[PDB]
């Protein structure tokens, strides 16, 4: 259990398909639990579509924690992970 500093991160700087699906699901679950949103809904009422809009604007406030097989991890905010 040790956090690898943001300076030296070995994993991909690209959001994987699994990370995107999980981020959307988690953010949509949060929104369905009445979490505040950071985009203009424009008539949207569905949490998954709201979360897709937030991902398109890179405004989802979540962090990906990528555990290496040795036990260490590194944190990638959703904004910095490039899609």
């Amino acid at each position: 259990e040790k956090a690898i500093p943001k300076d030296q991160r070995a994993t991909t700087p690209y959001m994987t398909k699994y990370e995107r699906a999980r981020i959307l699901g988690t953010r949509a679950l949060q929104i369905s639990m009445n979490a505040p949103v950071f985009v203009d809904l424009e008539g949207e009422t569905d949490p998954l579509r709201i979360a897709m809009k937030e991902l398109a604007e890179k405004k989802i406030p979540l962090v990906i924690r990528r555990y290496l097989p040795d036990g260490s991890f590194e944190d990638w905010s959703v904004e910095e992970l490039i899609v």
């Binding site: 259990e1 699994y18 699906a21 999980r22 699901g25």
Partner: protein, 1102 residues
């Protein structure tokens, strides 16, 4: 116009079916049973005796079914349709005459009843025998019903034809890797059925028997069977052949390797291993046990001091094993139709009755003993009361065996199921093809396709196309159109005739010359050698043709194995063939003229030797001509009609020889599911399920079989105007385009009729159910659930019943005074109508209620249609008539068949059918698509051109949506279409939450029980391969069975209510969600004492 025999010889087929129908296997077998086998069973168990009172013998002198000698006329039977309505067995009493002695030296007869025999429909004993459709109407029976099945408890049960290996015949079968050669004979005598193997082990031939404890050296057995010279053993199993003698010398030497032997010594060696006989007659364990050891070794009963027959049988079997050892491919093929025998309903019922009669007689003897076992007051008066009360066991056993299909025969000691099946009433052809069905023997090692393969030897014996899909494929076979199943003929006069014809008996000949001439066999048993075997065979066939020997006796000469075989047993499949003599066919059209005139029926063609039955083995020697135009002098027989190779069901297909064969098999499956007309009394019937087409049409292109089997009288389908073109894009991958307003006018319309049966049963506390009801609300208005009920509490006839409404108001006593409600609710997605309510009583006195619910169905998207060529497909779109393309006359298709279904399926018969039907409607005539024949395509083209249409059936059409001429000519005309029973209305199912299993807490498994759709291991694999973990959790745990268990963190054992109940703390109890299946698994493991302790850890804390 003079008869042309090259085309009028097919009339032998209608003449044949006029006297030997499609359901004749069943009818003949049941007639033979009730006419000879009952007498044979009675004679076998003629007397039943008791140990005490030798001045007492109870005799069985005569038996009969359905008729007393008090009245000349037969007994009154309840009509079969009345039995169908009241849920009774259609049965006749079993009358016997009894000689039971009185005490004061009195001998007398009687006519007593010992039960009821279920009567096969249209048998000798059936009331429907010889009724002329006016008696049929009065009896509420369809004249086109096949018969051949039973009605037990109101259910139509057919005893399916069973196919088994020939009994009492040797099958040689080699092997690879193992390198054994095994010859086995199944000796099925009347009292015993045993298998006598002749194995090969370490290069040495052995004998293996179930009774014998050890496999015996073969030379020991040949010595035990009187063949001790040890040189003739070589002359019996090898003859003069350097190879065979070399192979067998090892066993010859192993005879002495133990010791030198005499006959009695070998008998003692045999007898030292005969296991036991349940410790009875124990004083016989000596050399005197070999006798029953050897007379149990096969089906050849030796009852004297001669072992010639059995010794030569064993020697021939050993020779077969040796020939297989030297030259493989000299083994028998287990899937050859000559090696198969078909056992029938009569033989089945005979075995069943004999066993039930033995049990009846045992119990009756014991009851007699109990009655006469008193010191005083032992008057003989009325010894028959115990027969008046024990007679119900015969009736019960027969009914139970036919009803369940389970046959518990103790004498032969086998428990077989599936003997009887419910008569499928999906369609007229469905019932007909249910008859003529043959189920293959079990334990076939279904992993392989050996028996599943279609055999060339089934040509004209079993239908080449009528085999099911799914698991059963070749395991279920159907009789071909013109066949016959032989009957057991006595082998004694035939053996005498063989001796007369030049066969020197098997006891006059020496071993050296045994394999120098052909040996004559009789049911597989060698009965002598013959000089000039071909002349012997020819004289035997002349005797059969002139009527001196029975016509079902087959003779054939095998040339590799130098033998002349004569078969007399039943269960052989055979078909009539026209005899060809001197290069000429013997029918020559004068007999055809007489046949068409009315005299000279088919059996006269046998009584004059113009036709004869050939079984499969005789065809091994014949040389059959398909047509008279290709007879050569070397030929022996002529086909009566080559399309008879297809059965009844495959005879619906028009032009089946222009289709790829899987399409013909698919049509055999689909035609049985076609919705149409069931019977002329189909509205008097009250059946569990019945699909009826409103406006059945007979096909425009029929075949000879269709009119032979009367499918043109109860057709299942309609002649759809079909345009074969790509259209709208909803007709891709077999989907159909249906014309709205063809549907509006009644195309494809059908109704469902369903039956619900209730019994107002009676109870031990002098109580019974009631149908009280039809309660109202304050106004006096019936409540909604009783809206269509009527005063009696049984839904009114004619009224609509919706989902939730009651149509039988059944109240059950709360103490079976007070009546708990058990109403019969209609639970249907769509409303039904009540068209029949039948009130009646069953045989056991109690009221029976049947309510028939009818549901008119209109074709919709997803309804299934088929065109007799295996081109099924659902309705994919229903379009308005104006959107359909139209021709110059404004004709629009009722259906649009996509053209992409043709190039890969290669059903050219469907195109030929379209053209034939089109020319047929234009000309005013129904056309023919008979196999290997039918209406010629060029003649149909001539009709089309003469009527103004293109010869190829391609009309120029206008688009319905644009009005422009389509740039391609469209294949356009009538095609016969069947609406299949599979309607999306009965398939649509959706479950959100509903019943769960009490054990697993998982959604039920039944579409009727609102069950959920299983997510199996392969779907689980797919979801894992997607890497959808949360979806895995949601589908498997959360939305199937999520259980909030309490888990102790000290002991990994589930508690309850936050209570460890092993630590008794409530301190370490964690709350978590696991599948209830997992909770169940843990509680089951704890049962076996296994403790699957769960170790937990915080999800967080990193």
């Amino acid at each position: 116009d003079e008869i042309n025999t090259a085309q009028d010889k097919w009339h032998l087929l209608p003449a044949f079916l006029k006297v030997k129908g499609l359901v004749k296997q069943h009818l003949d077998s049941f007639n033979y049973f009730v006419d000879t086998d009952l007498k044979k069973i009675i004679k076998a168990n003629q007397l039943i005796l008791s140990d005490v009172d030798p001045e007492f013998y109870l005799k069985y002198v005569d038996i009969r079914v359905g008729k007393k000698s008090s009245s000349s006329t037969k007994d009154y039977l309840t009509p079969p349709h009345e039995c169908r309505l009241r849920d009774m067995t259609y049965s006749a009493p079993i009358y016997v005459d009894i000689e039971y002695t009185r005490g004061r030296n009195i001998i007398m007869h009687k006519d007593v009843e010992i039960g009821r025999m279920p009567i096969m429909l249209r048998s000798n004993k059936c009331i429907l025998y010889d009724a002329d459709e006016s008696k049929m109407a009065k009896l509420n029976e369809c004249p086109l019903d096949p018969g051949g099945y039973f009605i037990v408890n109101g259910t139509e049960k057919v005893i399916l034809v069973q196919e088994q290996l020939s009994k009492n015949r040797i099958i040689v079968e080699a092997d690879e890797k193992k390198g054994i050669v095994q010859a086995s004979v199944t000796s099925s005598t009347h009292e015993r059925k045993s298998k006598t193997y002749v194995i090969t082990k370490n290069g040495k031939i052995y004998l293996k028997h179930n009774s014998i404890a050890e496999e015996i050296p073969i030379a020991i057995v040949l010595k035990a069977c009187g063949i001790l010279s040890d040189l003739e053993i070589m002359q019996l199993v090898c003859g003069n052949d350097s190879s065979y003698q070399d192979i067998f010398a090892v066993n010859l030497e192993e005879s002495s390797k133990l010791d030198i032997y005499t006959q009695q010594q070998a008998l003692e060696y045999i007898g030292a291993k005969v296991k036991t006989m349940r410790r009875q007659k124990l004083t016989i364990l000596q050399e005197g046990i070999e006798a029953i050891a050897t007379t149990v070794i096969a089906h050849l009963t030796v009852e004297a001091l001669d072992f010639r027959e059995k010794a030569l049988y064993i020697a021939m079997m050993t020779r077969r094993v040796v020939m297989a050892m030297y030259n493989p491919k000299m083994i028998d093929d287990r899937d050859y139709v000559g090696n198969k025998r078909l056992e029938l309903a009569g033989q089945l019922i005979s075995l069943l009755f004999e066993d039930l009669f033995k049990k009846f007689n045992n119990d009756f003897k014991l009851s007699i003993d109990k009655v006469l076992k008193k010191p005083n007051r032992a008057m003989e008066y009325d010894a028959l009361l115990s027969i008046n009360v024990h007679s119900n066991n015969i009736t019960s056993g027969l009914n139970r065996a036919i009803s369940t299909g389970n046959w518990s025969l103790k004498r032969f000691k086998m428990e077989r199921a599936g003997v009887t099946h419910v008569l499928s009433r999906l369609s007229y052809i469905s019932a007909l093809g249910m008859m003529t069905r043959i189920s293959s023997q079990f334990e076939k090692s279904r992993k392989v396709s050996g028996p599943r393969a279609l055999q060339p030897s089934q040509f004209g014996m079993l239908c080449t196309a009528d085999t099911p899909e799914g698991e059963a494929c070749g395991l279920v076979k159907n009789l071909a159109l013109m066949t016959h199943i032989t009957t057991d003929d006595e082998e004694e006069p035939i053996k005498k005739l063989c001796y007369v014809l030049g066969v020197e008996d098997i006891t006059l000949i020496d071993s050296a010359s045994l394999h120098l001439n052909y040996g004559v066999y009789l049911n597989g048993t060698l009965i002598g050698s013959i000089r000039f075997p071909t002349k012997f065979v020819t004289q035997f066939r002349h005797l059969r043709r002139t009527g001196k020997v029975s016509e079902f006796i087959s003779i054939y000469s095998n040339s590799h194995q130098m033998a002349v075989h004569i078969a007399t047993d039943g269960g052989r499949i055979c078909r009539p063939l026209i005899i060809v003599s001197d290069g000429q066919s013997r029918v020559k059209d004068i007999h055809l003229r007489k046949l068409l005139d009315g005299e000279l029926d088919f059996d006269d063609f046998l009584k004059l030797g113009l036709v004869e039955y050939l079984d499969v083995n005789e065809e091994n020697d014949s040389y059959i001509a398909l047509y008279e135009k290709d007879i050569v002098p070397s030929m022996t027989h002529l086909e009566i009609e080559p399309f008879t190779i297809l059965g009844a069901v495959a005879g619906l297909i028009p032009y089946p020889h222009h289709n790829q064969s899987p399409r013909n098999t698919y049509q055999c499956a689909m035609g049985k599911q076609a919705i149409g007309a069931i019977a002329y009394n189909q509205f008097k019937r009250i059946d569990t399920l019945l699909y009826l087409m409103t406006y059945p049409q007979q096909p425009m292109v029929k075949t000879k079989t269709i009119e032979l089997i009367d499918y043109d009288k109860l057709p299942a389908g309609q002649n759809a105007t079909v345009a074969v073109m790509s259209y709208s894009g909803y007709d891709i991958e077999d989907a159909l385009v249906l014309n709205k307003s063809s549907i509006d006018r009644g195309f494809g319309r059908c109704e469902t009729r369903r039956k619900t049966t209730t019994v107002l049963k009676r109870y031990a506390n002098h109580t019974q159910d009631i149908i009280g009801g039809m309660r109202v609300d304050e106004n006096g208005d019936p409540i909604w659930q009783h809206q269509s009920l009527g005063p009696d509490g049984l839904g009114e006839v004619g009224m609509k019943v919706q989902s939730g409404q009651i149509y039988i108001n059944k109240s059950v006593p709360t103490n079976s005074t007070q009546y708990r409600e058990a109403p019969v609710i209609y639970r249907g997605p769509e409303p039904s109508h009540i068209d029949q309510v039948m009130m009646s009583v069953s045989d056991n006195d109690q009221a029976l209620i049947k309510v028939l619910l009818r549901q008119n169905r209109r074709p919709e998207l997803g309804d299934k249609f088929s065109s007799r060529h295996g081109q099924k497909g659902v309705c994919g779109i229903i379009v308005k008539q104006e959107d359909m393309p139209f021709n110059d006359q404004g004709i629009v298709p009722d259906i649009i068949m996509n053209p992409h279904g043709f190039p890969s399926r290669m059903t050219v018969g469907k195109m030929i059918e379209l053209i034939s039907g089109k020319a047929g409607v234009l000309n005013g005539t129904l056309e023919y698509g008979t196999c290997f024949g039918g209406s010629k395509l060029e003649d149909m083209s001539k009709i089309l051109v003469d009527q103004g249409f293109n010869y190829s059936g391609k009309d120029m059409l206008y688009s319905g949506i644009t009005g422009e001429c389509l740039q391609a000519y469209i294949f356009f005309g009538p095609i016969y279409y069947q609406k299949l029973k599979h309607m999306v209305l009965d398939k649509m199912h959706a479950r959100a939450r509903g019943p769960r299993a009490v054990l697993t807490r998982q959604p039920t498994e039944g579409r009727s029980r609102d069950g959920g759709l299983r997510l199996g291991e392969m779907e689980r694999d797919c979801v894992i391969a997607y890497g959808a973990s949360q979806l895995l959790l949601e589908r498997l745990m959360i939305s199937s069975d999520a259980f909030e268990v309490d888990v102790c963190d000290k002991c990994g054992l589930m508690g309850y209510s936050g209570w460890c109940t092993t630590c008794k703390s409530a301190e370490n109890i964690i709350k978590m969600t696991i599948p209830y299946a997992a909770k169940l698994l843990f509680q089951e493991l704890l049962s076996m004492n296994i403790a699957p302790r769960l170790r937990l850890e915080d999800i967080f804390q990193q």
